């Protein structure tokens, strides 16, 4: 993860350099097979693509400076080093499928442009997201 | 001075002993056991709103010139029925509110019965000794549908009139007694003078009398044979575990009653139903697009659309293509009414059943139910495929063919999927009993094996793998939060906690209470084992 | 105020969860990361329901 | 210029299938970062995982 | 818990008073397309629905919220007496009917 | 004892927020192209006269201060304080719903002049960007309410603490996008 | 074990709880009745054949399915060996165990190989 | 055809659609002038001045608002001829094979007049001899009155009727009451 943070600087600097060249070459070059002027679409997109890579790169860089030498990042690690517990991984759930079905309902709502369908699909999506998050929290039945 | 009121009531009717038993009857608490009450409360609202609605309604066909409140219909010749229905909604303070309450209550009534019937079907509550209740209930749903039909056809507007035209022309086309039957019902050619008077009396008196009588018989018969219950902990076929009538069941019944009443009272204001002013007086020559009956009548109308033109022209006689529709509708009802008997015929089960069964443990019946639901839903949709075609941009001919073909292919796919899913649900139950709850805490052993921690619900041997428990007919937990391992251990409000002393003291009592509760169920089972031994 | 369910940790040269670091490789357990599983069948408070049909 | 209702279904379907791609990229990117076997450095993982990373 | 119940009770009272006030004083008579005060009219039935719904629904919520917060927790077990009757009485009811016929 | 591995859920959410930036890259691209076209004619300036710049300031601070309170709510989650989390999250919900109502009122006060979606290219571009942002803010508020339900139902474990830290990440991102979007629309005009 | 009404608990775990599986003859009967109805749809008032081609395709699929259901077909096991695959009745050595504890596959490694795995040749026996 | 954005056709199908207009008012009238020079038929209805009548064709006796006596007659005319293809209150209806009678909300009064003066696709043509000027104006009065009048009681569920009232209850109405029952009762 230490080397994962660093490798994003490559694309970051590349995109940052291209987003400068693009702007200056579109507004000051007459080719005859195009018209002079800033592109305004390839400039914003390239700047913000550099932004994405920079964001992820910086976040991983700040994160990796507070982390110990992990066995997966150690060259001569033994298998018996990670002998503890990993995290909590969800064994099963029906809510992904239903949640996808809810997004498919407001999809058709927007297609047909039916207000009731959009409203129901929006509330249906809220419901399924809520159930997904409150899956492992549902209290024991208070009878 | 209440003991003296009791003293007088007892000294006359010897009622102390016979009411102690009434207030001590125990009823199983389950959310699905309240579905019948919705039908009951909706029926009560219908009777009350219906009586109020008859103080302003004149069920006559005699033509008059309208000069009432609704100015956009002033000067048109209409019947007395339509004119007075227009006066309930435009000249009576809160008459539209009550009219809409009535119609909404009708809808809820029919859907409540449908959902209740589904609960009865899936859980197997129709088995011995409760077949009489099934037959009574089936008659209740058919009469409910008939009641609603003759109710919406009272205003004598253009939409409802086409329903009567359809109904009359269905009857007239019957093979032998088809034209003689029509003259006996309507009192002549359609329309006729006495028609809306025969419909009014059948609607305010004849059917509701029969309905009330059947309902009363239904409830008494249920109350006599206590109730069924799911096979939970400590529960046998010779006991009922739940709550007594008072103080807990009676109050809960009232609360839910008010909830339904309040909900119908909201709908009566906030949403429009049967806007009869938009439609005009009935005219045999004019019609509208779609022109569907009520939702509960759509299956019958959907049957007529998907039946091909199969007329039989005998010698100087005719069997209309509608006749086969009647035959089909005659089969569906007969199949529904005599279900417990065909259940018993093909299964060879003739025992006394007091314990319910989860739908997942009876895959054939569950699958047949979902097969029949798809059949009913396809009939309902195809009865109203004109509104589906226009709003969802599909060919109307394509809709007709979907209905025709879907009634063969839809049920088959429904059965297959439902059966497989029922067995799947059975398998997931067995995994927990055999291996334990999947915690979801994946941990790595020193050798490098990833293993998920399993929580056994029974005793283990001495080699990891715990002795699997047999199925017991009840729900087995599948999450660790279902055992209260995610329970909040803070007592207090939203902004501030409770004092420590009042907090720790409170956790102790709740802990002791839940332990003792589980102990009651354990002790119950033990006594029941020894009971069933004999 | 510290929640009862909060893991008993020394508030010195150690912090169980911050913005970006944690103690596990994955999601923290929603039933307490310091909870030892499995436990005896008694603690679960599950009552196996003996049932007989007919 | 395209009054058909099919074109809206196309748009919406493309949009939806594009959500599944980001949903898959999110956990194909953080599985690499967080969940690796003891000894499996970034430069020990196969070419296939590097390609899915990029 | 007492404040939770009382919230729904006060809200129901407000709803009831609202329904009475709207039923009596709100403009209820029919107004046509162009007529001023069409909005005041087309909101009469909705207002009745809103208020009556609020009153009855809130009272229902208050009553249910009382039983699950204040009434104690009960598990009751009743013995079933059903199926065929006792033989003593069984042969006693058929013998009586047979006697009446013979 | 235990090492200090990266927060997996935090890393997951940051990767999700990155993609949410490119969604606004599209909207900004559409806005800037339309702005270039508008300034070429000189018709942009006429359409901008419908903007209430002072009103858009106090709404912005209402959002910005919300982020502040949100951070306090997270400062209470790093330690075991369930009540510190509960208080500040409620304040941020209120302060965010006030933004939504404020933005909604601006929309209703913007149709009064002639700034509509189908009234001009400016109107189309103004409503698309701020409309999508409004949807995101609503989603953020709903995220807060769901996490407030989680804190009420489950026991306040580091798992629940992590769930609140990431929703704060989402909120900060949405506020930052607003900051960048307000400068573009109101300051730069 | 524990076969109820002809259906085994091994395939259907709740065998003794309710109705569990019908007979092959009722599925066939329903299928053929359905085929009759699907063929009978071809008689009526319709001029188009875009619905005929739709009926015949579905009927053909249904007939194919019912024939598969009737003449239950089975296949043989492919008794082949591809590349470095072992014939059935082979035990796979625990590679990771043999790697951790020098024994078996990692049994006969010389000093040269021992140094290659950063294992000083001294921890013998 | 042009103003309503129905022309030009972009693809052959069951039925041409209304969409966003391609031309303005003036351009439409120029194309119309050119077309009518190749042998003219029905013309646009004008008023006192040389302007296209819009709010003036909202009733025979229209002055500043719709007369309630016009909607009464227009209602029965509308019901007799066009309640079938359209809905009762012109909500739309389906036809043979991918065709339909569109919802009437989007058309102005001139478009209504010209719609029943010409006969677009599968709509029959109603000449002035068949439905007179006064009858047509009454039909417009009814159309524009039923559209622009909110329901007296409730939220009119798209005015579709028994099919929309049965979906609100049988799918949404019962679900709320189930949720209430699931709240009061137990899961065991
Ligand atoms: C709660 C408090 C009560 C509230 C009063 C209002 C509601 C009435 C409640 C009726 C239900 C009573 C509970 C019950 O069912 O148990 C029966 C219960 C006794 O239980 P039990 O000893 O097991 O009876 C069974 C017998 O062994 C066998 O009985 P049998 O063989 O002799 O047959 C008796 C059978 C009837 O006979 C049959 O079985 C039919 C057979 C026909 C074959 C041909 O039914 C009865 O007679 C039971 C009482 C019915 C009375 C009708 C209700 C009168 C209400 C008056 C208000 C008017 C409005 O009866 C009562 O308690 C009497 C009810 C008292 C009614 C007095 C009301 C007068 C108004 C004063 C109000 C002042 C304020
Ligand atoms: C303990 C308790 C409350 C139990 C609950 C029992 C209960 C409420 C059961 C439900 C009622 C039942 C069985 C309904 C039948 C349902 C059904 C099949 C159809 C619906 C009925 C229906 C359509 C009603 C509408 C119109 C209609 C036909 C009404 C019936 C008309 C008649 C015949 C009314 C008089 C009968 C009546 C109400 C009797 C009360 C019962 C008692 C205690 C009678 C005692 C009795 C007396 C006092 C006599 O003098 C007498 C003289 C000559 C012969 C017999 C009797 C007789 O039985
Ligand atoms: C329970 C509730 C709805 C509370 C809300 C408060 C309320 C009643 C508000 C409305 C106020 C009213 C009704 C004002 C008007 C008063 C007036 C002028 C007339 C009232 C009479 C009326 C509406 C209709 C005519 C007669 C009537 C009450 C008919 C319907 C009731 C019927 C058919 C009862 C069957 C008779 C009978 C023998 C019943 C057996 C025993 C009982 C108590 C049955 C009912 C019953 C109940 C009530 C359950 O909750 C239940 C729950 C779970 C399982 C089973 C049952 C069950 O069987
Ligand atoms: C034995 C066993 C246990 C199972 C086997 C089941 C089996 C084969 C049973 C035999 C079936 C059989 C022979 C049934 C009799 C069929 C006959 C002759 C029925 C005639 C009965 C009759 C009078 C029917 C009336 C016709 C109906 C129900 C029409 C439907 C209908 C009605 C009633 C409307 O009001 C309506 C209003 C608006 C739009 C549409 C409709 C509409 O379609
Ligand atoms: C028997 C019914 C039992 C009622 C149940 C009790 C409910 C209490 C609340 C009652 C609601 C009040 C409604 C009063 C209505 C009102 O305001 O009346 C107007 C002028 O009243 C006045 O100033 C004085 C009104 C005094 C009457 C109020 C009576 C309530 C109390 C005093 C009686 C106690 C009840 C005892 C309970 C017994 C229970 C029995 C079950 C007449 O002007 P009008 O021009 O004719 O317009 C007409 C519309 O009003 C009209 O609705 C109609 O619908 C239109 O068609 C139109 O003609
Ligand atoms: C709960 C999930 C629900 C999923 C259901 C989805 C299945 C729906 C399938 C839809 C197929 C529709 C294709 C359209 C076809 C069409 O439009 O053709 C029509 C005739 O429709 C037909 O026969 C087709 C009917 C056959 C449909 C079979 C449906 C059975 C379903 C239920 C089972 C399969 C799916 C199972 C999914 C279950 C999920 C679990 C896995 C006639 O054409 P026509 O209106 O006359 O118009 C033209 C002139 O305009 C023009 O001049 C031209 O010249 C003319 O020739 C004429 O064509
Ligand atoms: C099929 C029978 C049919 C009858 C009868 C009918 N219409 Fe239509 N109507 C149509 C069809 C089909 C269209 C769509 C034609 C098109 O748009 O190209 C249509 C289109 C219209 C339009 C254009 C709709 C719009 O949204 O712009 C108006 C306005 C209209 N009709 C009104 C009427 C009036 C007014 C009457 C009678 C007094 C009437 N129609 C009778 C079928 C009918
Ligand atoms: C008019 C509508 C109906 C009403 C008001 C009604 C009322 C009730 C009530 C109150 C109960 C007891 C409580 C419960 O278990 O939910 C009940 C039970 C029952 N009903 Fe209904 N019911 C109606 C329709 C039906 C229908 C249509 C059927 C069957 C087709 C049916 C069959 C049964 C059965 C078998 C029971 C017994 C449940 C049990 O005891 O385990 N009912 N009904
Ligand atoms: C099973 C119970 C009942 C059902 C399902 C039912 C159903 C209906 C329906 C669907 C309507 C059409 C409503 C409308 O026009 O908006 C209606 C109207 C009517 N019902 Fe009922 N009803 C029932 C009971 C009763 C009873 C008991 C009475 C009278 C004592 C009654 C009197 C009326 C009257 C007078 C109308 C006409 C008034 C009107 O059309 O507005 N109903 N009913
Ligand atoms: C259970 C079986 C029901 C039988 C129905 C048969 C199938 C045909 C259905 C046709 C659907 C027509 C849809 C349509 O045209 O849409 C609309 C017309 O009808 C409706 O409005 C549908 C209302 C249905 C209830 C939804 C309420 C949402 C609030 C929920 C809050 C709890 C037109 O679109 P619009 O209203 O303008 O957005
Ligand atoms: C993909 C998620 C789906 C989200 C569903 C939300 C749907 C919002 C529809 C708003 C329609 C209002 C337009 C209108 O006719 O009013 C117009 C004015 O609209 C506005 O200025 C405010 C609109 C708010 C912007 C919302 C943009 C959201 C982008 C969602 C992308 C589909 C007035 O139209 P009129 O003159 O009456 O013809
Ligand atoms: C218009 C299209 C017509 C469709 C044609 C399809 C008809 C196929 C007929 C096949 C007959 C099979 C007979 C048979 O073998 O008996 C049995 C079929 O099963 C049944 O008992 C039928 C019960 C149907 C009742 C459905 C209503 C209940 C659901 C309501 C819930 C609300 C088979 O039993 P077996 O396998 O021999 O043990």
Say if A101 is an interface residue toward chain D (CB within 8 Å).
no
Return d(Cα C46, Cα B525) in angstroms, integer. Answer: 13
Q: Is B91 in the pocket of ligand 5 (CB under 6 A)?
A: yes
Alpha carbon H14 to chain centroid distance? 20
Tell me, in angstroms, the distance from the centre of ligand 7 to residue B271's CA.
29
Scanning E42-86, the segments in alpha helix (DSSP H) are 44-67
In the block, tokens 């015929």 appear at B345
| Burial readout G28-53 (b: 16 or more C-beta within 10 A, e: otherwise) | eebbeebbeebeebeeeebeeeebee
Render D10-44 in DSSP notation, one character per residue. HHHHHHHHHHHHHHHHHHHHHHHHH---TT--GGG
Residue B29 inside a domain? The answer is yes
D-F contacts (CB, under 8 Å): 21
Q: Which of H91, B399, D8, H10 is nearest to A112 (CA)?
A: D8
Residue B471 has what DSSP assignment?
P
Say if D37 is an interface residue toward chain B (CB within 8 Å).
yes
Instruction: Mark residue E57 as left, alpha or beta (left: phi above 0; alpha: psi -120 to 50; beta: remaining).
Output: alpha
Q: Which of B279, B158, B163, B296 is nearest to H167 (CA)?
A: B296
B-F contacts (CB, under 8 Å): 22
Per-residue three-class SS string for B213-275: HHHHHHHHHHHHCCCCECCCCCCCCCEEEEEEHHHHHHHHHHHHHHHHHHHHHHHHHHCCCCC
Question: In chain D, what residues touch C24 (CB-CB under 8 Å)?
Answer: none
Contact by Cβ (8 Å): F101, F134: no
Question: In chain E, what residues touch H184 (CB-CB under 8 Å)?
Answer: 64
Instruction: Please report the sign of the dihedral spanned by the C-alpha atoms of residue E32, residue E37, residue E43, residue E48.
Output: negative
- Extract long-range pairs of B21-26: CB within 8 Å, 24+ residues apart: B22/B245, B23/B244, B23/B245, B23/B246, B24/B244, B24/B245, B24/E78, B25/B223, B25/B226, B25/B244, B25/B245, B25/E78, B26/B226, B26/B240, B26/B241, B26/B242, B26/B243, B26/B244, B26/E76, B26/E77, B26/E78
Domain boundaries, chain A: 1-143
Residue F1 inside a domain? The answer is no
Count Cβ atoms within 10 A of the Cβ of residue C7 and give its class: 0-12 exposed, 13-18 middle, 19 or more buried: middle
Residue B507 inside a domain? The answer is no
Contact by Cβ (8 Å): F69, F95: yes
Return d(Cα D7, Cα F186) in angstroms, integer. Answer: 35
Tokens, residue B321? 């293509």
Residue nearest to atom 20 of ligand 12 (CA): B342
Give the domain range for residue F122: 8-187
Residues B177, B182, B183, B185, Cα dihedral to 10°: 110
Q: Which of B529, B251, B289 is nearest to B390 (CA)?
A: B289
Contact by Cβ (8 Å): F36, A42: no
Residue B281 has what DSSP assignment?
B
Q: Which of H188, H82, H74 is nearest to H141 (CA)?
A: H74
Tell me, in angstroms, the distance from the centre of ligand 2 to residue B203's CA.
22
Return d(Cα A64, Cα E23) in angstroms, integer. Answer: 68
**In sequence order, which residues have a C-beta less than 8 Å from that of residue G66 and are 6 or more positions away?**
G28, G31, G32, G35
**Upstream peptide bond of B191 is cis (omega within 30 degrees of 0):** yes
- CA distance readout (Å), F144 to F17, F73, F96: 16, 11, 10
Return d(Cα F67, Cα F64) in angstroms, integer. Answer: 5
- CA distance readout (Å), B299 to B44, B121, B122, B138, B375: 26, 20, 22, 16, 9
Return d(Cα B215, Cα B43) in angstroms, integer. Answer: 10
| Chain F residues within 8 Å of chain B (Cβ atoms) | 82-83, 86-87, 90, 152-156
Q: Which of E7, E54, A124 is nearest to B263 (CA)?
A: E54
Find the discontinuities in chain E where C to next N exceeds 2.5 angstroms and give the residue preceding each: none
**Upstream peptide bond of A82 is cis (omega within 30 degrees of 0):** no
Return d(Cα B181, Cα B190) in angstroms, integer. Answer: 12
Residue B65 has what DSSP assignment?
E
Residue H63 has what DSSP assignment?
S
Do chains G and F have 3 or more beta-carbon pairs under 8 angstroms? no
Residue B437 inside a domain? The answer is no
Are F82 and B496 an interchain contact pair (Cβ–Cβ within 8 Å)? no
Which residues, judged by CB distance below 6 Å to any ligand atom, belong to the binding site of ligand 4? B 149, 163, 166-167, 170, 293, 297, 300-301, 304, 326-327, 329-331, 334-335, 338, 342
From chain H residues 29-48, the ones with a CB under 8 A of any chain B CB are none
Residue B327 inside a domain? The answer is yes
Return d(Cα H98, Cα H13) in angstroms, integer. Answer: 8
| Burial readout G4-21 (b: 16 or more C-beta within 10 A, e: otherwise) | eeebebeebbbbbbbbbb
Tokens, residue A119? 């409203």
Are H177 and B38 an interchain contact pair (Cβ–Cβ within 8 Å)? yes
- Length of chain H equals 188
Return d(Cα B305, Cα B399) in angstroms, integer. Answer: 10
Helix H or strand E segment including B450: strand B450-455
Q: Residue B6 CA: which ligand is closest?
A: 1
Are D4 and H13 an interchain contact pair (Cβ–Cβ within 8 Å)? yes
**CATH number for the domain harbouring residue B251:** 1.20.810.10
In the block, tokens 């009967």 appear at G29
Residue B250 inside a domain? The answer is yes
Q: Is G36 in the pocket of ligand 12 (CB under 6 A)?
A: no
Residue F133 inside a domain? The answer is yes
Question: Within 13 Å, how many C-alpha atoms sit on residue F39's CB side?
Answer: 9
Say if D35 is an interface residue toward chain B (CB within 8 Å).
no
Alpha carbon B122 to chain centroid distance? 12
In the block, tokens 């259901």 appear at G69
Tokens, residue B229? 């219950």
Alpha carbon D23 to chain centroid distance? 6
Treating both helix axes as pointing N-terminal to C-terminal, what angle do B95-123 and B35-53 enclose, rounded to 10 degrees? Answer: 150
Treating both helix axes as pointing N-terminal to C-terminal, what angle do H133-148 and H109-118 enclose, rounded to 10 degrees? Answer: 130
Residue F90 inside a domain? The answer is yes
| Residue B312 backbone phi and psi in degrees, to 5 | -105, 115
Which residues, judged by CB distance below 6 Å to any ligand atom, belong to the binding site of ligand 11? A 110, 118; F 107, 111, 116-117, 127, 131-132
Obtained via which technique?
cryo-EM
- CA distance readout (Å), B527 to B26, B534, C51: 19, 11, 12
Return d(Cα C7, Cα C16) in angstroms, integer. Answer: 8
Q: Which of H98, H92, A108, H171 is nearest to B399 (CA)?
A: H98
Q: Which of B188, B278, E57 is nearest to H152 (CA)?
A: B278
Q: Which atom number of ligand 12 is nearest to the Cα of residue B332?
A: 27
Alpha carbon B54 to chain centroid distance? 28
Q: Which of B355, B346, B130, B236 is nearest to G20 (CA)?
A: B346
Return d(Cα F41, Cα B195) in angstroms, integer. Answer: 74
Work out the number of other CB atoms within 10 angstroms of the CB of residue H30: 13
Tokens, residue B130? 């409760």
| Beta bridge partner(s), residue B27 | B243
Residues making up the annotated binding site of B for heme are 102, 116, 203, 218
Question: Within 13 Å, how many C-alpha atoms sit on residue B365's CB side?
Answer: 27
Are C29 and A88 an interchain contact pair (Cβ–Cβ within 8 Å)? yes
Count Cβ atoms within 10 A of the Cβ of residue H82 and give its class: 0-12 exposed, 13-18 middle, 19 or more buried: buried
Residue B325 inside a domain? The answer is yes
Render G45-67 in DSSP notation, one character per residue. S---STTHHHHHHHHHHHHHHHH
Q: Are strands B77-78 and B64-65 parallel, antiparallel or unpaired?
A: antiparallel
Say if D37 is an interface residue toward chain C (CB within 8 Å).
no
Contact by Cβ (8 Å): B144, B211: yes
Residue from G45, G46, G47, G48 to probe ligand 6 pocket by mutation (most atoms less than 8 Å from CB): G48
Are D37 and B393 an interchain contact pair (Cβ–Cβ within 8 Å)? no
Give the domain range for residue B61: 2-423
Question: Considering CB atoms only, which of A51, A133, A139 is closest to F146?
Answer: A133
- CA distance readout (Å), D19 to B92, C44, D14, E71: 55, 40, 9, 50
Tell me, in angstroms, the distance from the centre of ligand 9 to residue B509's CA.
54
Return d(Cα H65, Cα H67) in angstroms, integer. Answer: 6
Contact by Cβ (8 Å): F2, D16: no
Tell me, in angstroms, the distance from the centre of ligand 11 to residue A118's CA.
12
**CATH number for the domain harbouring residue F45:** 1.20.120.80
Question: In chain C, what residues touch F82 (CB-CB under 8 Å)?
Answer: 1, 3
In the block, tokens 């059975």 appear at B426
Question: In chain B, what residues touch C34 (CB-CB under 8 Å)?
Answer: none
Are B488 and F153 an interchain contact pair (Cβ–Cβ within 8 Å)? yes
Count Cβ atoms within 10 A of the Cβ of residue B157 and give its class: 0-12 exposed, 13-18 middle, 19 or more buried: buried
Rg for chain G (alpha carbons), in Å?
31
Q: Is B436 in a helix, a strand, or coil?
A: coil
| Beta bridge partner(s), residue C21 | F6
Q: Is G100 in the pocket of ligand 12 (CB under 6 A)?
A: no
Instruction: Please report the sign of the dihedral spanned by the C-alpha atoms of residue F71, residue F74, residue F76, residue F82.
Output: positive
| Beta bridge partner(s), residue H94 | H100
Tell me, in angstroms, the distance from the centre of ligand 5 to residue B93's CA.
10
Q: Is B443 in a helix, a strand, or coil?
A: strand
Return d(Cα G30, Cα G97) in angstroms, integer. Answer: 57
Contact by Cβ (8 Å): B433, B469: yes
Question: Considering CB atoms only, which of F82, F87, F90 is closest to B490?
Answer: F82
Contact by Cβ (8 Å): F95, F66: yes
> What's the distance, Cα to Cα, between the start and end of chain E in Å?
70
Say if B90 is an interface residue toward chain H (CB within 8 Å).
yes
Q: What's the farthest any 2 CA atoms get from each other in chain B? A: 96
In the block, tokens 């912005």 appear at F60
Q: Which of B122, B296, B124, B120 is nearest to B218 (CA)?
A: B120
Q: Is F6 in a helix, a strand, or coil?
A: strand
Residue nearest to atom 18 of ligand 2 (CA): B214
What's the total number of domains in chain B? 1
Per-residue three-class SS string for F59-76: HHHHHHHHHHHHHHHHHH
Residue nearest to atom 8 of ligand 7 (CA): H123
Question: In chain D, what residues touch H13 (CB-CB under 8 Å)?
Answer: 4
Question: Considering CB atoms only, which of H71, H151, H183 is closest to E42?
Answer: H151
CA B239-B244-B248 angle, 5° bins: 145
Residue B69 inside a domain? The answer is yes
Final resolution, Å: 2.9
Contact by Cβ (8 Å): A88, C30: yes
Render A61-120 in DSSP notation, one character per residue. HHHHTS----GGG-TT--GGGS-SEEEE-----SHHHHHHHHHHHHHHHHHHT-HHHHHH
Q: Is B204 in the pocket of ligand 10 (CB under 6 A)?
A: no
Render B29-60 in DSSP notation, one character per residue. --GGGGHHHHHHHHHHHHHHHHHHHTSS----
Contact by Cβ (8 Å): H182, E64: no
Q: Is B458 in a helix, a strand, or coil?
A: coil
Treating both helix axes as pointing N-terminal to C-terminal, what angle do A9-26 and A42-64 enclose, rounded to 10 degrees? Answer: 160
In the block, tokens 């659609």 appear at H17
Per-residue three-class SS string for B333-397: HHHHHCHHHHHHHHHCCCCCCCECCCHHHCHHHHHHHHHHHHHHHHHHHHCCHHHHHHHHCCCHH
From chain C residues 11-50, the ones with a CB under 8 A of any chain A CB are 20-21, 24-30
What's the total number of domains in chain F? 1
Are B481 and A85 an interchain contact pair (Cβ–Cβ within 8 Å)? no
Residue F119 distance to chain D (closest CA, Å): 20
Tell me, in angstroms, the distance from the centre of ligand 6 to residue B93's CA.
50
Question: In chain B, what residues touch F153 (CB-CB under 8 Å)?
Answer: 486, 488
Residue B385 distance to chain D (closest CA, Å): 19
């Amino acid at each position: 993860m230490k080397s994962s943070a660093k490798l994003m600087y490559g694309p970051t600097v590349f995109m940052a350099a291209m987003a400068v060249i693009y702007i200056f070459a579109t507004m000051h070059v007459s080719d005859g097979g195009s018209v002079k002027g800033v592109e305004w679409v390839g400039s914003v997109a390239l700047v913000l693509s550099a932004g994405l890579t920079l964001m992820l790169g910086v976040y991983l860089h700040f994160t990796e400076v507070r982390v110990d030498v992990l066995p997966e990042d150690w060259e001569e690690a033994e298998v018996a080093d990670k002998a503890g517990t990993l995290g909590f991984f969800s064994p099963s759930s029906i809510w992904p499928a239903a949640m996808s079905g809810a997004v498919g309902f407001l999809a058709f709502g927007v297609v047909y442009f039916h207000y009731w369908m959009i409203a129901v699909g929006l509330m249906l999506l809220i419901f399924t997201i809520t159930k997904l998050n409150l899956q492992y929290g549902v209290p024991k039945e208070k009878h | 001075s209440l003991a003296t009121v009791g003293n007088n009531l007892d000294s006359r009717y010897t009622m102390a002993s016979g009411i102690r038993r009434q207030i001590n009857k125990v009823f199983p608490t389950h959310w699905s056991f309240m579905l019948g009450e919705i039908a009951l409360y909706s029926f009560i609202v219908l009777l009350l709103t219906g009586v109020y609605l008859t103080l302003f309604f004149d069920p006559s066909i005699t033509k008059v010139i309208y000069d009432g409140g609704y100015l956009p219909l002033n000067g048109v010749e209409m019947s007395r029925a339509y004119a007075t229905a227009l006066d309930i909604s435009f000249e009576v303070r809160g008459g539209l509110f009550i009219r809409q309450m009535h119609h909404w209550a009708a809808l809820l009534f029919v859907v409540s019965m449908l959902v209740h019937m589904l609960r009865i079907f899936f859980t197997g509550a129709f088995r011995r000794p409760r077949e009489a209740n099934w037959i009574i209930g089936v008659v209740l749903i058919i009469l409910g549908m008939a009641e609603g039909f003759m109710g919406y056809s009272l205003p004598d507007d253009l939409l409802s009139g086409v329903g009567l035209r359809i109904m009359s022309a269905i009857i007239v086309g019957l093979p032998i007694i088809g034209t003689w039957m029509h003259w006996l019902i309507f009192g002549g050619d359609f329309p006729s003078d006495l028609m809306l008077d025969r419909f009014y009396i059948a609607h305010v008196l004849i059917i509701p009398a029969i309905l009330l009588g059947l309902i009363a018989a239904h409830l008494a018969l249920v109350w006599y044979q206590k109730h069924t219950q799911f096979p939970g902990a400590g529960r046998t076929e010779n006991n009922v575990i739940g709550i007594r009538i008072m103080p807990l069941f009676a109050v809960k019944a009232v609360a839910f009653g008010l909830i339904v009443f309040g909900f119908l009272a909201l709908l009566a204001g906030v949403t429009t139903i049967n806007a009869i002013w938009n439609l005009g007086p009935y005219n045999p020559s004019q019609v509208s697009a779609g022109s569907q009956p009520d939702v509960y009548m759509l299956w019958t109308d959907g049957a007529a659309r998907v039946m091909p033109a199969w007329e039989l022209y005998l010698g100087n006689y005719t069997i209309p293509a509608v006749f086969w529709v009647a035959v089909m509708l005659g089969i569906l009802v007969v199949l529904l009414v005599t279900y417990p008997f065909i259940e018993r015929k093909f299964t060879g089960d003739d025992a006394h059943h007091n314990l319910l069964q989860r739908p997942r443990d009876v895959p054939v019946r569950t699958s047949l139910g979902v097969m029949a639901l798809v059949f009913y839903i396809l009939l309902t949709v195809s009865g109203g495929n004109d509104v589906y075609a226009m709003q969802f941009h599909v060919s109307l001919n394509a809709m007709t063919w979907i209905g025709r073909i879907g009634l063969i292919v839809g049920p088959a796919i429904a059965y297959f999927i439902t059966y497989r899913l029922c067995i799947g649900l059975q398998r997931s139950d067995r995994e927990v009993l055999e291996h334990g709850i999947e915690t979801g805490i994946i941990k790595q052993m020193p050798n490098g094996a990833f293993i998920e921690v399993h929580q056994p619900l029974g005793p283990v041997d001495d080699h990891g793998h715990p002795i699997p428990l047999p199925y017991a007919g009840a729900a087995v937990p599948k999450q660790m939060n279902q055992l209260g391992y995610a329970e909040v251990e803070t007592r207090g409000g939203f902004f501030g906690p409770d004092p420590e002393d009042i907090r720790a003291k409170a956790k102790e009592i709740e802990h002791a209470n839940h332990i003792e509760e589980a102990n009651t169920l354990r002790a119950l089972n033990e006594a029941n084992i020894e009971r069933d031994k004999n | 105020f510290v929640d009862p369910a909060w893991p008993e940790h020394n508030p010195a040269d150690g912090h169980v969860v911050t913005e970006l670091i944690s103690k596990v490789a994955g999601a923290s357990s929603p039933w307490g990361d310091d909870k030892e599983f499995p436990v005896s069948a008694e603690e679960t408070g599950y009552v196996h329901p003996y049932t007989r049909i007919n | 210029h395209s009054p058909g209702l099919g074109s809206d279904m196309w748009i919406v379907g493309v949009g939806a299938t594009g959500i599944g791609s980001v949903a898959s990229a999110i956990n194909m990117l953080t599985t690499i970062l967080c969940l690796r076997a003891p000894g499996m450095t970034m430069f020990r993982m196969p070419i296939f995982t590097w390609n899915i990373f990029v | 818990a007492a404040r939770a119940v009382t919230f729904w009770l006060v809200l129901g009272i407000i709803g009831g008073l609202g329904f009475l006030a709207t039923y009596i004083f709100w403009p209820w008579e029919y107004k046509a397309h162009g007529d001023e005060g069409l909005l005041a009219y087309t909101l009469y039935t909705p207002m009745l629905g809103i208020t009556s719904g609020l009153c009855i629904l809130s009272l229902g919520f208050a009553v249910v919220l009382y039983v699950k917060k204040f009434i104690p927790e009960e598990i009751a077990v009743q013995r079933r007496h059903d199926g065929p009757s006792e033989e003593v009485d069984r042969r006693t009811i058929v013998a009586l009917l047979n006697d009446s016929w013979q | 004892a235990a090492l200090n591995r990266p927060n997996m859920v935090s890393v997951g959410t940051i990767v999700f927020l990155s993609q949410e930036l490119m969604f606004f890259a599209g909207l900004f691209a559409m806005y800037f192209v339309s702005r270039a076209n508008g300034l070429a004619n000189g018709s942009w300036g006429e359409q901008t006269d419908h903007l209430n710049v002072p009103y858009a300031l106090l709404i912005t601070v209402i959002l910005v201060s919300s982020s502040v309170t949100c951070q306090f709510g997270v400062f209470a989650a790093e330690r075991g304080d369930v009540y510190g989390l509960r208080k500040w999250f409620l304040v941020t919900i209120i302060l965010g719903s006030i933004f939504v109502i404020g933005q909604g009122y601006e929309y209703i006060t913007l149709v009064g002049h002639g700034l509509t979606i189908q009234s001009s290219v400016y109107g189309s571009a103004f409503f698309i960007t701020t409309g999508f942002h409004a949807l995101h803010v609503i989603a953020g508020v709903m995220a807060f309410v769901v996490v407030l339900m989680r804190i009420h139902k489950s026991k306040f474990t580091p798992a629940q603490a992590t769930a609140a830290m990431v929703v704060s990440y989402y909120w900060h991102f949405v506020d930052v996008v607003w900051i960048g979007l307000f400068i573009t629309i109101y300051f730069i005009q | 074990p524990e076969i109820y009404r002809g259906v085994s608990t091994l395939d259907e775990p709740s065998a003794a709880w309710g109705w569990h599986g019908l007979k092959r003859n009722t599925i066939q009967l329903a299928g053929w009745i359905s085929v009759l109805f699907m063929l009978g749809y071809n008689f009526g008032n319709h001029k188009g054949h875009v619905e005929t081609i739709w009926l015949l395709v579905i009927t053909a699929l249904l007939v194919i399915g019912l024939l598969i259901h009737l003449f239950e077909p089975k296949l043989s096991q492919v008794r082949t060996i591809t590349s470095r695959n072992k014939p059935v009745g082979h035990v796979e050595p625990d590679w990771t165990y043999d790697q951790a504890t020098l024994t078996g596959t990692w049994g006969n490694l010389t000093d040269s190989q021992l140094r290659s795995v950063n294992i000083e040749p001294s921890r013998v026996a | 055809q042009v103003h309503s954005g129905r022309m030009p056709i972009l693809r052959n199908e069951a039925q041409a659609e209304r969409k966003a207009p391609r031309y303005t008012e003036a351009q439409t009238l120029a194309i119309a002038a050119y077309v009518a020079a190749n042998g003219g038929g029905p013309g646009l209805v004008y008023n006192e001045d040389g302007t296209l009548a819009m709010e003036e064709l909202r009733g025979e006796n229209y002055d500043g608002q719709i007369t309630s006596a016009d909607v009464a007659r227009g209602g029965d005319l509308f019901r007799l001829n066009c309640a079938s293809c359209h809905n009762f209150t012109g909500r739309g209806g389906a036809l043979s094979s991918g065709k339909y009678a569109p919802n009437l909300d989007a058309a102005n009064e001139q478009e209504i007049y010209q719609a029943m003066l010409t006969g677009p696709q599968n709509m029959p043509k109603f000449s002035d001899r068949q439905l007179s000027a006064d009858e047509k104006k009454d039909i417009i009065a009814f159309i524009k009155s039923t559209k622009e009048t909110p329901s007296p009681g409730g939220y009119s569920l798209g005015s579709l009727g028994p099919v929309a009232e049965g979906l609100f209850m049988w799918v949404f109405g019962i679900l709320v009451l189930v949720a209430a029952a699931m709240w009061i009762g137990s899961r065991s």
